[PDB]
Amino acid sequence: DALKLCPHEEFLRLCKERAEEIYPIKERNNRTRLALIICNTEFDHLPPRNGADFDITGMKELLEGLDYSVDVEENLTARDMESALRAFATRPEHKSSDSTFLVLMSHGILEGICGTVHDEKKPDVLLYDTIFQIFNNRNCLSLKDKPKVIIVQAARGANRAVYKTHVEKDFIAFCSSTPHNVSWDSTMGSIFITQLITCFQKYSWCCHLEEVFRKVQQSFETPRAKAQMPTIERLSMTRYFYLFPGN
Amino acid sequence: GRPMEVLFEAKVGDITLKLAQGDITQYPAKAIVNAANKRLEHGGGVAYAIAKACAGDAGLYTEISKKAMREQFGRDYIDHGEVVVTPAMNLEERGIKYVFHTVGPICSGMWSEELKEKLYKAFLGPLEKAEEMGVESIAFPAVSAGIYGCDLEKVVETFLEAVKNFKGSAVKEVALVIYDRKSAEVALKVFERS
Ligand SMILES: N=C1O[C@@H]2[C@H](O)[C@@H](COP(=O)(O)OP(=O)(O)OC[C@H]3O[C@@H](n4cnc5c(N)ncnc54)[C@H](O)[C@@H]3O)O[C@@H]2N1CCC[C@@H](N)C=O
Numbered sequence A: 001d002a003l004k005l006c007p008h009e010e011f012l013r014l015c016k017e018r019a020e021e022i023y024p025i026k027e028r029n030n031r032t033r034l035a036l037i038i039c040n041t042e043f044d045h046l047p048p049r050n051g052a053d054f055d056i057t058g059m060k061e062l063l064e065g066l067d068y069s070v071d072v073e074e075n076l077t078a079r080d081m082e083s084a085l086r087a088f089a090t091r092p093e094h095k096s097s098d099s100t101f102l103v104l105m106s107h108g109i110l111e112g113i114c115g116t117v118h119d120e121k122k123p124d125v126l127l128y129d130t131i132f133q134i135f136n137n138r139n140c141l142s143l144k145d146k147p148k149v150i151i152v153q154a155a156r157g158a159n160r161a162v163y164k165t166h167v168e169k170d171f172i173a174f175c176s177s178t179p180h181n182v183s184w185d186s187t188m189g190s191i192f193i194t195q196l197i198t199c200f201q202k203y204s205w206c207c208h209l210e211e212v213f214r215k216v217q218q219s220f221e222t223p224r225a226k227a228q229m230p231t232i233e234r235l236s237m238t239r240y241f242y243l244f245p246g247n
Numbered sequence B: 001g002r003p004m005e006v007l008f009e010a011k012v013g014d015i016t017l018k019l020a021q022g023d024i025t026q027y028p029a030k031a032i033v034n035a036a037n038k039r040l041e042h043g044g045g046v047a048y049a050i051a052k053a054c055a056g057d058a059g060l061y062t063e064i065s066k067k068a069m070r071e072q073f074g075r076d077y078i079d080h081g082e083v084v085v086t087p088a089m090n091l092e093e094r095g096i097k098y099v100f101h102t103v104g105p106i107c108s109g110m111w112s113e114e115l116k117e118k119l120y121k122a123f124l125g126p127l128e129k130a131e132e133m134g135v136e137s138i139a140f141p142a143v144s145a146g147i148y149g150c151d152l153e154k155v156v157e158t159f160l161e162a163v164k165n166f167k168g169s170a171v172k173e174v175a176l177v178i179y180d181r182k183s184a185e186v187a188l189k190v191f192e193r194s
Helices: A008-017 A052-065 A078-089 A128-134 A191-203 A209-219 B045-055 B058-073 B089-094 B113-133 B152-165 B181-193
Strands: A033-039 A068-074 A100-107 A112-114 A125-127 A148-155 A171-176 A231-233 B005-012 B015-021 B031-036 B084-087 B098-103 B137-140 B173-178
Touching: A033 A052, A033 A078, A052 A068, A052 A100, A052 A191, A068 A078, A078 A100, A078 A112, A078 A125, A078 A128, A100 A112, A112 A128, A112 A148, A125 A128, A128 A148, A148 A191, A171 A209, A191 A209, A209 A231, B005 B181, B015 B181, B031 B045, B031 B113, B045 B058, B045 B089, B058 B084, B098 B113, B113 B137, B113 B152, B152 B173, B152 B181, B173 B181
Parallel strands: A033 A068, A033 A100, A100 A148, A148 A171, B015 B173, B031 B098, B031 B137, B137 B173
Antiparallel strands: A112 A125, A171 A231, B005 B015, B084 B098
16 A cells, blocks of 8 residues: 555646646755644643554655655644744745645644643643744745645544735645544554545545545545544635645 | 363462453452553453443443543543552442453563563552552453563563562452463463462
């Protein structure tokens, strides 16, 4: 089970015939794609997220297979999560990139994602609005007009003047809020990350990003799984994002 | 019920230590130990067997166990050495009053001094809990020797070390219960070396 690649002659064809409808791909020789994974597995005041180590490795190798250089940050407070995202936003390799992936995995509440020291009486929450503000068109010019994909696994149960339409552009968020119920089966981790990787491996060669996310959602379109249905949120993409694996 | 066969009996201090072959859900001890995970989610292994025998539905005993864990520790998870106590419910008819939930480490075929200390605390914890409550008899499964993949001989050796180092006057009987016959023969060899 590996990433299926798109032939190069189809990569040049789709980039030429549907140029106005797809995000442009930087030439591979001068392209330095960057991705970031922030994953909190152990918490001071919350249950551990077992299986997260398999989700980190799976997502890292998937993104590297899509020609992304992946920084991995683990077990960060909400303050340090924000600092890591701001630092990632200022990286110069983004100027030589066409896109970016952010993968955030932790416990969550409605308004944001939890840091390692979170507790309901002393919260440690990175607000979702802060994430999009850090990478918007005003604050991150190197990724302006470029697709910014935010994969969020924020397990619920941690707590017992529209300037946005103009600046927040080319985002898409794919979110799973399922309470952490990973089995204590070594061959896999969370079902959401497993299905996400499988659909990328099977469909990235022929489908754009939103179609890949719909394939993941389809795998949850069954009575036993529909309550855990991942959702597409804060969509602001102006074109289709074809990954063109291998190109 | 099914046959409970004592394969070894000896005195460690005033404590009578036994090795038995059979089903721990049928062993006549006031407390039986569950090889749980840190969340008390009894979804497989001896944990599922104990949970279904206690409540008829393993999912129900999981919720009962999670309520007890929060009451006794103020949080929804435990670490190696900590013990959550739950009523044995349907197992009372076999003389069992409590289930002591302990959590061993995940070796996955490896062995180290770090893994041994975690398993040692998971064996000593229930013994100290029994002493604290005045529970006179306690039975153990081979914690971590199944799904968590710790070597059975090292598990039994670590269990014996916890029993020998345990100091208590209330605990009079300790038992290790092995289900399958082949693993019980392996445990008996370890018992006789020590
Ligand atoms: N959700 C869960 O909660 C538990 C823990 O997470 C974990 C701990 O594993 P453990 O510490 O190695 O203990 P085990 O039960 O595996 O074995 C312990 C030993 O007792 C034996 N034995 C089994 N029956 C009986 C019985 N009636 N009487 C007496 N002896 C019995 C076994 O033969 C073995 O020798 O497993 C559980 N589990 C499933 C997760 C696996 C799944 N996700 C796929 O991977």
